[model samples]
Target: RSTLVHWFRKGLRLHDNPALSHIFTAANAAPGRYFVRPIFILDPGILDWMQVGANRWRFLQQTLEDLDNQLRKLNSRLFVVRGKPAEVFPRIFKSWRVEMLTFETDIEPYSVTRDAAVQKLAKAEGVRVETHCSHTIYNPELVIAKNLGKAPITYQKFLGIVEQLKVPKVLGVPEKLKNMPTPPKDEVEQKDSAAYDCPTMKQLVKRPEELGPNKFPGGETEALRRMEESLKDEIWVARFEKPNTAPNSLEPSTTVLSPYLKFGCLSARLFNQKLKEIIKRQPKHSQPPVSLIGQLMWREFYYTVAAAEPNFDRMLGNVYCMQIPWQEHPDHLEAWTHGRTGYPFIDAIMRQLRQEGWIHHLARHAVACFLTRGDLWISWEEGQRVFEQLLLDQDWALNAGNWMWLSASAFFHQYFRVYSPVAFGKKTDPQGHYIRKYVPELSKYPAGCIYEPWKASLVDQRAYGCVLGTDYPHRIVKHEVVHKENIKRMGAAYKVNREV
Candidate 1:
């Protein structure tokens, strides 16, 4: 007679879960009386963050609620235990005398530490423990190249290795675990009380009073629907390339897949397989429809890099760039966060982020330029913190990767290239139409001059019924001056790479 406990972590989905599959395999073969308990530990450090914002909490609460329902259907309800693993695991171990513990691997630094501690306790108590990497399509270690011991940094090299690796076939939910086995009674008494009380929109965000309103609801069913809508006969994936570029754009042109990707509602394997199939049938040199695929690959590449270099979480993917003299401007930071940056594109994106829980990559890039290149002083960490609050994705790997990429801390550019808000606005947005929607105070101005109203004469300003400082924000810092300052700063830190 043997007892088994299946610990569920990041691999929320039952589909293609190797750990869950292994548990089922072991249970069926075991001769004597066997028990299987599916456990979900609610760490306070992870849960307290759940209420940081409505968007995050909503996705998390919804995912947990759905998982509970699913597990309940199997006759074994998800045991929601509270307290840190170090404290909680031992009590459960002593009470149940669990013979074996099995779970999927977690790649993050925090998980690594927590798992090691738990594994030690499990071993000390004479219980066998096993874990498998269930997050990525292939394990991070298997993707390494024969030429070098270390993983590649460049996207091409990373993608090449991914192509060479034996890709897993899309696996549907396993059928073996239809029957659930019961263990001891719910030992962790305050379990149900420990469940998350999801926050409303107003409680989670800043300037909730001012934001125009956001339209998307957060859930796994909705996430799966988004994936279907993108890949279905609707052919909606075409919009990703030109997502926020055009003036006439209403809804985000791309598939709204980040929240799904963030939560693992839709498996990466499922998503990547669908994209590859799409690429094979599509027209060449016209629309690759590879952005989502590329981004997914890039996401994997960062994890590989993070795996190879454990210090990456601290260094932020910047192998060469050292810390520079960062300016401490609290008011300026507040201004940027509040959409009072005086750059219309900056304000538009900031305002949108404030209103909605997400923003597209292009707008994110432009805002990055305005902050690091345009202002030339704010730390990338500052922007990342603000983004953590605003962005629905907020995956540590993607968040750090993007911040490092934008600040040029991790790449060749090194923040020397400053984007002119006026020129970029005219080029990308062209008429400042996005500006009007976010900043209604500037709605009186002609769409053409909305980006640079400071350039307009007093009569023109009066005629347009918009004032530079009063009606709309004035330019915070001149582009030419900021460009020179940023060049000087970047020159001291990194070699100028014109090619990149």
Candidate 2:
């Protein structure tokens, strides 16, 4: 009898998952004598460096629970093993008699290093290893190969390369496990099985109650539910333009499938296919760069670049990242981090992210620009780290790529144009409803004063039941005076970057 192990990394769902299907194929070879184990290993080496925060930790806990429930339905369950993969695999393989190892492909630099280590052990241990790409629509390595060994820096170039390439179709889920038959392990002690149970939120986060409501629960079930709910408005799906979405709306303007995608609870190909179907029947649909399809492609573009780019997450040692000497103020950075920037729009957005772990793309642009070249002139790396910890959808490639783009370090270079924390929110929310909902101190202030409550007279502030610097913080920096000076500084940085 042969034993096969399917390691569940980001590819958490069984539906439309190629690697999981491969697990079935390999097991079917041995017929009824085979045993299979689906596993998710938590390594502090991976989680510690990633710096995932409370909100995301809770989401992960929920996802594991749901995934476990599904696995149980199939007469098996996820083995929630702790310890590094290299350490855990060796011990498990000996005891479980693992003959083959299979997993979904991950292209992140850290993932690459870790997988290489595991592959080395598998080779020496005499266990066959198989991997498939399902987390992304196209394998980033394949995309890089198509681009003559260089990952495309520009989205236009990325599209040109992928224009000829096609995304692989989704794999149908295994309805039953008879074809992928497993030897029943009824003899395995109940005490041992309990030790491998999914972890609880209390194990990861203290006071999980203080964080926020579970508006978007994690796991494959919730991922599919949200996708179904979002697609019901086919007209909206057809006309969707990412830039046209409201940044400050109480409800998210976009589909918000990103968190599910980040965790691989949902299949990218299936979502892409569903979108294609919706757009095909429409008389006219918004096209790429702003369309719903454009957003997913943007994700693929970043993954492709990050796959080949060294130190893609940091400003230092990153080839594509502009070497700008960003100034920092400890107090300013702390204020920005805690949503005390005193620009109501900026505060509301930041507060929402900390509390709910999600925010609109344009809202991200506003705060990110405020932190970098636009106002404080802090490094985008700082913002990247903060988002990495806070955002539920914080995929490393996307977080770093978007930060660089927002900061004019790469992908985008319109440094002269900047988002005014005060004015940008006003464009979408003239009444300051978004600000009021999130930053409640400004709720009583009139619409004119809501975005910039520091400008309100003390008499009005007192009457409004909030006073600047007391009830709410005063504006950290005068946006009007500082942005002009910052623009000149940006011009200098761009010039220096170009000359070198």
Candidate 3:
């Protein structure tokens, strides 16, 4: 083969990259003219209707830009192109005289379909194509138990399999791409039109001016630095010590590596390796690093499920789940999205998402439950879409899995439960710090009274200098009503499970 085309999709780094490593090894050994052309295809199907929310789009654009910079040092660059791979690959093969394509297995639904079409096209053109499961510790197909007989729908069973698997030793980085085929010098037509319009910090938040002078750097280097800095933070340290409501309270509570993971800027393999070293050094590190690693494993599990069960995204994974009536109320959904569902805690959390492009994990579950199980009859898919738009750490696997889990559509039996927004706020955010910060309309009241502004007297409300229905949006679902209703609903469901 004269040229080896590394079809770079999501796997971004040199360390532990099975697909990219294979391409480097194969292309380097060849005698004829050869080079690795890393290609990232922008799918029109996905970009067409997806809302390029401020936080996520900004993060992705930065990742690509950073990845481009990294490759430049290696005498290479990412081939940025648009359109479906089936169409794009043929053009690349003809133009570059490429003879082979290597890539990682895509576990998502659309990715699988797109890869299949591209594979068919490549085979017809007499080009060899290959894929590897580089995104997960274990491949989806091999993770099942012999006695269980099939895929584990619940996470508990899935985690059990994760415990049993012997993770491969971390792979090393590849040397170079000699005689590489570079993307045609950047041309006007080659640039992604949508990428140019990615929102700035000003557009992402209401008071962009208040977002501090510094911004989190978006590429692989910065992502790792952030992880290092987090490990030292006192806030994160305390939270990690106790597996409480917000595990991210520790200095390195969370890796904040979701955007990088999503973009392939930093491979999970490299991250896991670095994480292990950190755990080893800090033997007294509070939380079991396994808990964090388990979250990553969960990421792979959902993607694998997405590949095996095509309809999982559209319908409930468990057939019995399809019967539950999900109410479709756009008005209620609007409240959820705008952070004005009239429920203080839910609104407060939504406001945080709008303001910061991030939140504690527990806040995510609470906000999601308030939407799918509390106010609206909307499906988890709807909430998942919202998360994709807004969440900086959004992974299709984690987003979809959590949404379905919250909606009681997946793994509901083992740990199925919905949140009481009012109670959750009262307990977790007792000082109303989160609420008063984002829900500025409640800022006038004391932190104690901010959690439930509805309780403030007419004079007290006026005294606070903000009006609820006038200044901020009125409550969508009355707090007391939804709390009572959800309790009854969950209580009955729990009884049925106990009996079964």
Q: TM-score for each prediction?
A: 0.85, 0.97, 0.84
Reference-based TM-score, model 2: 0.97
lDDT for each residue of candidate 2 in 1-500, tens digit (9 for 90 to 100): 66788999898887898777777665665567668888899887886678787899988999999998988776667878888887888877776778889899888888999999999989988998989888899889899999899898988898889989977978877545665544444323344656677998888677676468689999999999999999999999999988889999889999999999999988989999999999998968898889898899999999988888759999988988999889869999999999999899999999999999999999999999999989999999999989998999999899999999999999888888989888898888999999999999889998987988877899999999998889999888988889999999888998998898
Off by over 4 Å in 3: 30-32, 48-51, 145-149, 178-216, 231-253, 278-290, 316-322, 375-377, 414-418, 487-500
Model 1 residue 204 distance off true place after TM-score fit, in angstroms: 9.8
Tens digits of lDDT, candidate 1, 1-500: 45677887676666666676666667777634567766777676764432245455555556666666665555555665655788878987876668888887766677788899999999899988888765677677776544266777677777777777788767665445444445544544445543423333443344435443445544445666778777884233433444334432346756668876676666788887877777666644123224657667777877776666545544444453355556778877887888887877778888887677677777787787667645747887778777877676777666766767777777435455666667775764666777878887777778667887777788988887877888777777777787788778777756433333
Alpha-carbon error at 193 in model 1, in Å?
8.3
- Lowest lDDT 10-residue stretch of candidate 3: 245-254
Pick the TM-score winner. Answer: 2
What is the C-alpha local distance difference test score of each model? Answer: 0.67, 0.87, 0.65
Candidate 1: regions farther than 4 A off: 1-3, 24-36, 46-51, 144-147, 176-184, 190-216, 233-248, 283-290, 315-322, 414-416, 456-466, 495-500
How badly does each model clash, as a count of residue pairs? 0, 0, 13
Per-residue CA lDDT of model 3 for 1-500, tens digit only, reads 35677776677665567777777777667734575677677666776635546656556666666666766766666666666776777777776677778888867777887888888888888988878877776777776443154677666777777677777666776766666555343233356533323233443344334342224456776766765665565444333432364512322235566766776666776666665666666556544323555556667667656545666655544442433456688888887888878777788777677655676677787888777665454667778777777777776667766677777666654333546666766654567766666677787778666767777887898888877788766677664576567556655655665575
TM-score of 3: 0.84
Which has the higher lDDT value, candidate number 1 or candidate number 3? 1
The lDDT of model 1 is 0.67
Candidate 3 yields a Cα-based lDDT of 0.65
Candidate 2: pairs in clash: none
